[PDB]
From a paper:
Dus2 is found in all eukaryotes and catalyzes formation of dihydrouridine 20 in tRNA.
Mutation of the conserved residue, K371, reduced the binding by ∼8-fold while that of K419 or K420 by >4-fold respectively, demonstrating the importance of interactions engaging both α1 and α2 helices. The double mutant led to a ∼17-fold decrease in the apparent affinity for tRNA, rather hitting for an additive mode of action of these residues. Similarly to R361A–R362A, this effect is purely attributed to loss of positive charges since the structure of K419A–K420A is similar to that of the wild type (RMSD of 0.6 Å over 82 Cα).
Numbering used by the authors: 349 to 441
């Protein structure tokens, strides 16, 4: 159950309904299957002030390799890696 699963992704807000995001889809999958809910860890780097995040779900870790303009945006990209690497739907129009 070790290691980190990764992809190069960014969250594109106009590709989803304003009120249904990847973080919320991931939370609903955890409720349905009675798993512990997700834990995020987010950091900002001094080189260029961008953010990156890692999410832990069911003892497995997931991360995007790109950096983005806010904590919220980084956290949404982490959620996408978790869902898309597993073939789960993520809310796209
Ligand atoms: Cl959450
Ligand atoms: Cl934002």
């Amino acid at each position: 159950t070790s290691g980190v699963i990764k992809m190069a992704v960014k969250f594109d807000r106009r590709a989803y309904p304003a009120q249904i995001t990847p973080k919320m889809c991931l939370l609903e999958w955890c409720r349905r299957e009675k798993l512990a809910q997700p834990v995020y860890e987010t950091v900002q780097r001094p080189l260029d002030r961008l953010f990156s995040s890692i999410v832990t779900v069911a003892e497995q870790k997931y991360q995007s390799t790109l950096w983005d303009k806010s904590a919220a945006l980084a956290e949404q990209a982490a959620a996408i890696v978790c869902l898309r690497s597993q073939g789960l739907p993520e809310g796209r129009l």
